[PDB]
Amino acid sequence: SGFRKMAFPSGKVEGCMVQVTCGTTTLNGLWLDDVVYCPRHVICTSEDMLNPNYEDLLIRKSNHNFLVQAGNVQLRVIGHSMQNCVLKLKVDTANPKTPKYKFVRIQPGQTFSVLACYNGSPSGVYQCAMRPNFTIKGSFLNGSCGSVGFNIDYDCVSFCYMHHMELPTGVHAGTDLEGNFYGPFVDRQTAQAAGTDTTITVNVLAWLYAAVINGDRWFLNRFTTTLNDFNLVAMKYNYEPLTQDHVDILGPLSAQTGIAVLDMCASLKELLQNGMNGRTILGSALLEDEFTPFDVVRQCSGVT
Amino acid sequence: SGFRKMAFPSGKVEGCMVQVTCGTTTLNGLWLDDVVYCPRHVICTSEDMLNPNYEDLLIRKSNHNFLVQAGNVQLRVIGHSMQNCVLKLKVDTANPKTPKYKFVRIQPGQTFSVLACYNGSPSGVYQCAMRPNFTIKGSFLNGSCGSVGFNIDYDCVSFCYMHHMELPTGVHAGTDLEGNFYGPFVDRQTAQAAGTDTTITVNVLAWLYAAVINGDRWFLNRFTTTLNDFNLVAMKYNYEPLTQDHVDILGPLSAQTGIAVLDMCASLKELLQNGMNGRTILGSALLEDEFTPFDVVRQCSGVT
Ligand SMILES: CC(C)OCCCN(Cc1ccco1)C(=O)Nc1cn(C)c(=O)c2ccccc12
Ligand SMILES: CC(C)OCCCN(Cc1ccco1)C(=O)Nc1cn(C)c(=O)c2ccccc12
């Protein structure tokens, strides 16, 4: 029992972190096989970041201008290319610690772990979610660009995020491992505002199921609702609309607890309308939305 | 910017996890050098757990009765001994992945990361704190015994916790790596109640400093207080008393923000008395106490 915000074990990703330096700019890179992936803004000077033309700036860079250091040893760069907002640096040595991996582009509401790194060295690991406005609420200081987000399925690491930027409001933006930004963000120092950060409804419901499984049941009410009635309330409270696909995904949690999905929706509707009244659920005084239904099943069953 | 509950990178500890089986009981072990450390109740059957006499039960066990599996390969046990509530199994092979390490016994209020494991395989990593009642609020299912808690200082892992038990209230109890339980708990299936789980005041203050550093400043008030006046309020709200040692530890955070420690105490006093009024601090609707002042400095400075 007990329910914690849990990150994946980070070892498989730690073995991939390298430092990439171009000129006087240093950030993190991800070394998989004989390729090092890093944010393309490693080629920029501070002055270039106001309005960079990456294709033009890249012309002034050769293989020998990219310094890649894995631990305290230098990797030889034998090729380089730009794919969207990431640079792929071909090195002469395959990473001996390369885990089985995939590159995946996640949808909003999906969670993942971030291994925050500085100078190619891991500092910590935390769990977060792709917000519905395509930002993440991370913990990133200068030098953390190139840190990655991932999920693990047994022995395969699915990389889903690479850190690029902080918006002026302190929220974070980045790309998938193909270099495509999540959301409308661009790698340029121009003020970019985020859209509404709505609450991930299917994740709140999953966490209410986790709470029932662990014995926090005070919020269970005597009501039910429909998807349409619930969604009227969800819209009022800036919660994402609940679809039958979300209901389907909650099926195993509904089966384990015996609480119909629409009954849990009605309990969540009452929590939104009445508030918590100074009470807590799983040690939180607000409704947690960074656990997917799969995370709850995984944590409550002990998948390794 | 951004402030997250961050665990240490778990790779160095992942390389130490093994599965230990004795008879039909299986749990996790920690392999450092040529010794595997695990909870002594691996020698017990379910019936023995009601009132075990470990010294007597251990007489019926030889080296060949302990099965230690590291990955999918078996380690040869060449010696065994009981130290308090842990068994030390001497193996014929030093763990090639043994990191630099120390065994430390932490004080209440100190935080650490837990690598939850099942069958010697890591499932996840989370950050928690030794509560003032010497329990931890973890996330542990059957099979998680032997999972460890640790802190990392550059390349040295300081192991501070080994998981042994869940109390009937769903909170967790365990030992240091010398086998001494934190608190008064015993490894026997007898109902054991925990004392008052008070809030770690110095950690709440540290987290209020982290909030100011990241721009959440609404709670900053126009008051100051004294240690004695603050402690009258702390006692009323089941907060640990604040000492001058805690004030000393908050010094670097006071210096960085320009907010005197006693001024932050007065702001915390007003939050305790007025509540949050539906507002949040660092995305939390309650006062967080599982960040030490050192964790805040580390996270806000980017120590790797
Ligand atoms: C858009 C994201 C990716 O980067 C944002 C941060 C960009 N950097 C850091 C960086 C990345 C590569 C090379 O330098 C940066 O120096 N920008 C600034 C540019 N200029 C001209 C300023 O005057 C300035 C003033 C204050 C703070 C930042 C800046
Ligand atoms: C005290 C801590 C360490 O262990 C608590 C759990 C102890 N175990 C598991 C275990 C560890 C080693 C061997 O078995 C256990 O089986 N106890 C029970 C004993 N008996 C006799 C019951 O009837 C019973 C009924 C329901 C649930 C648990 C038990």
Q: Is B192 left (phi over 0), alpha (psi -120 to 50) or beta?
A: beta
CB contact under 8 A, A121 and B304: yes
CB contact under 8 A, B7 and A125: yes
Report the largest interatomic distance among the alpha carbons of chain B, rounded to a whole angstrom. Answer: 68
Residue with tokens 């609480």: A259
What is the residue type of A161? Y
Token pair for A145: 């660009």
Closest CA to B14 of B88, B87, B164, B117: B117
- What residues are paired with A199 via a beta bridge? A239
Interior CA angle at A70 toward B295 and A181, to 5°? 70
E runs forming strands in A76-190: 77-83, 86-91, 100-103, 111-118, 121-129, 148-153, 156-166, 172-175
Phi, psi (5° rounding) for residue B231?
-65, -25
Chain A hits for B2, Cβ within 8 Å = 137-140, 166, 170-172
CA of B284, closest CA in chain A: separation in Å? 7
Interior CA angle at A160 toward A159 and A164, to 5°? 110
Task: Give dist(CA A303, CA A300) in Å, integer.
Answer: 9
Task: Give dist(CA A68, CA A57) in Å, integer.
Answer: 19
- Is residue B39 packed enough to be buried (19+ CB in 10 Å), middle (13-18) or exposed (0-12)? buried
Evaluate whether B138 touches A2 at the Cβ level (below 8 Å): yes
Assign A161 to helix, strand or coil. Answer: strand
Task: Give dist(CA A302, CA A236) in Å, integer.
Answer: 36
Helices (H) and strands (E) in chain B, counts: 8, 13
Token pair for A201: 């409804």
Distance from chain centroid for Cα A98: 21
DSSP string spanning B178-236? TSPBSTT--SSSS--------B-HHHHHHHHHHHHHTT--TT--S----HHHHHHHHHH
All structural domains of chain A, each given as residue ranges with its CATH number in brackets, are 1-14+100-197 (2.40.10.10), 15-99 (2.40.10.10), 198-301 (1.10.1840.10)
CB contact under 8 A, A170 and B2: yes
Task: Give dist(CA B241, CA B202) in Å, integer.
Answer: 9
Task: Give dist(CA A170, CA A139) in Å, integer.
Answer: 9
CB contact under 8 A, B1 and A278: no
Evaluate whether B149 touches B176 at the Cβ level (below 8 Å): no
Interior CA angle at B119 toward B116 and B123, to 5°? 30
Query: Which residue from A minimizes the CA distance to B9?
Result: A124
Task: Give dist(CA B116, CA B124) in Å, integer.
Answer: 5
Q: Which residues contact A245 (CB under 8 A, 6 or more apart)?
A: none
- Is residue B85 packed enough to be buried (19+ CB in 10 Å), middle (13-18) or exposed (0-12)? buried
Instruction: Please name the helix (run of DSSP H) or strand (run of DSSP E) that holds residue A20, with its range, or none.
Output: strand A17-22
Task: Give dist(CA A267, CA B95) in Å, integer.
Answer: 51
Task: Give dist(CA B161, CA B167) in Å, integer.
Answer: 16
Query: Does the CB of B123 have a partner CB in chain A at under 8 Å?
Result: yes
Distance from chain centroid for Cα A23: 29
Closest CA to A81 of A63, A96, A64: A63
Task: Give dist(CA A68, CA A163) in Å, integer.
Answer: 18
Buried b (16+ CB within 10 A) or exposed e, B203-213: bbbbbbbbbbb
Closest CA to A294 of A107, A100, A116, A147: A107
Among protein residues, the one with the nearest Cα to ligand 2's atom 28 is B46
Task: Give dist(CA A240, CA A288) in Å, integer.
Answer: 14
- Is residue B220 packed enough to be buried (19+ CB in 10 Å), middle (13-18) or exposed (0-12)? middle
Between the alpha carbon of residue B286 and those of residues A92, A276, B60, B89, the distances in Å are 51, 12, 51, 44
CA of B171, closest CA in chain A: separation in Å? 7
**Size of chain A in residues:** 304
Beta strands A73-75; B148-153: pairing state: unpaired
Distance from chain centroid for Cα B94: 27
Assign A240 to helix, strand or coil. Answer: coil
Report which DSSP code applies to A281: B
Q: Is B233 left (phi over 0), alpha (psi -120 to 50) or beta?
A: alpha
Token pair for B292: 């030490």
Query: Does the CB of A155 have a partner CB in chain B at under 8 Å?
Result: no
Closest CA to B44 of B30, B28, B58: B58
Task: Give dist(CA B1, CA A54) in Å, integer.
Answer: 26
Give the active site residue among A16, A85, A145, A160: A145
Instruction: Please name the helix (run of DSSP H) or strand (run of DSSP E) that holds residue B274, with its range, or none.
Output: helix B261-274
- What residues are paired with A101 via a beta bridge? A157
Closest CA to A32 of A43, A22, A18: A18
Interior CA angle at B46 toward B43 and B47, to 5°? 105
Interior CA angle at B260 toward B255 and B263, to 5°? 150
Closest CA to B117 of B92, B144, B90: B144
Among protein residues, the one with the nearest Cα to ligand 1's atom 8 is A46
Evaluate whether B183 touches B171 at the Cβ level (below 8 Å): no
Q: Which residues contact A25 (CB under 8 A, 6 or more apart)?
A: A41, A42, A43, A44, A45
Phi, psi (5° rounding) for residue A231?
-65, -25
Closest CA to B246 of B205, B288, B301: B205
Report which DSSP code applies to A80: E
CA of B158, closest CA in chain A: separation in Å? 16
Between the alpha carbon of residue A9 and those of residues A32, A131, A183, B98, B139, the distances in Å are 18, 22, 28, 17, 15
Between the alpha carbon of residue A63 and those of residues A49, A54, A164, B112, B235, the distances in Å are 22, 16, 22, 42, 64
DSSP string spanning B128-172? EE--TTS-B-----TT-TT-EEEEEETTEEEEEEEEEEE-TTS-E
Q: Is the CB of A166 under 6 A from ligand 1?
A: no
Handedness of CA A266, A261, B168, B197 (dihedral sign): negative
CB contact under 8 A, B304 and A123: yes
Q: Is the CB of A47 under 6 A from ligand 1?
A: yes
Which B-chain residues 165-184 have CB contacts (< 8 A) with chain A? 166, 170-172
Between the alpha carbon of residue B303 and those of residues A124, A147, B155, B157, B298, the distances in Å are 9, 14, 12, 15, 5
Closest CA to A223 of A271, A255, A187: A271
Evaluate whether A249 touches A293 at the Cβ level (below 8 Å): yes
Interface test with A, best of B27, B139, B288 (most A CBs within 10 A): B139
What method did the depositors use to determine the structure? Answer: X-ray
Query: Which residue from B minimizes the CA distance to A285?
Result: B285
Closest CA to A192 of A177, A173, A164: A173
Task: Give dist(CA A297, CA B274) in Å, integer.
Answer: 38
Which A-chain residues 200-229 have CB contacts (< 8 A) with chain B? 214-215
- Resolution limit in angstroms? 1.5
Task: Give dist(CA B117, CA B18) in Å, integer.
Answer: 9
- Is residue B51 packed enough to be buried (19+ CB in 10 Å), middle (13-18) or exposed (0-12)? exposed
Task: Give dist(CA A297, CA A205) in Å, integer.
Answer: 13
The residues of B annotated as belonging to the active site are 41, 145
End-to-end Cα separation, chain B, in angstroms: 16
Q: How far is the CA of A189 from the centre of ligand 1 (A)?
A: 6
Give the active site residue among A41, A80, A164, A246: A41
Closest CA to A177 of A296, A5, A37, A28: A37
Task: Give dist(CA B135, CA B277) in Å, integer.
Answer: 30
Chain A hits for B299, Cβ within 8 Å = 124, 139
- What residues are paired with A86 via a beta bridge? A39, A83
Q: Residue A154 CB: number of other CB atoms within 10 A?
A: 8
Between the alpha carbon of residue A262 and those of residues A229, A259, B188, B244, the distances in Å are 10, 8, 42, 53
User: Which residues' Cβ are closer than 6 Å to ligand 2?
Assistant: B 25, 41, 44-47, 49-50, 164-165, 187-189
Token pair for B129: 């704190």
Residue with tokens 């300081």: B158
Token pair for A118: 């500085």
Report which DSSP code applies to B170: S
Evaluate whether A57 touches A44 at the Cβ level (below 8 Å): yes
End-to-end Cα separation, chain A, in angstroms: 16
Evaluate whether A166 touches A185 at the Cβ level (below 8 Å): no
Interface test with A, best of B8, B12, B27, B123 (most A CBs within 10 A): B123
Query: Does the CB of A277 have a partner CB in chain B at under 8 Å?
Result: no
Instruction: Please name the helix (run of DSSP H) or strand (run of DSSP E) that holds residue B294, with its range, or none.
Output: helix B293-301
Interior CA angle at B100 toward B95 and B105, to 5°? 105
Q: Which residues contact A131 (CB under 8 A, 6 or more apart)?
A: A108, A137, A171, A194, A197, A200
Token pair for A6: 């849990």
Ligand index nearest the alpha carbon of residue B166: 2
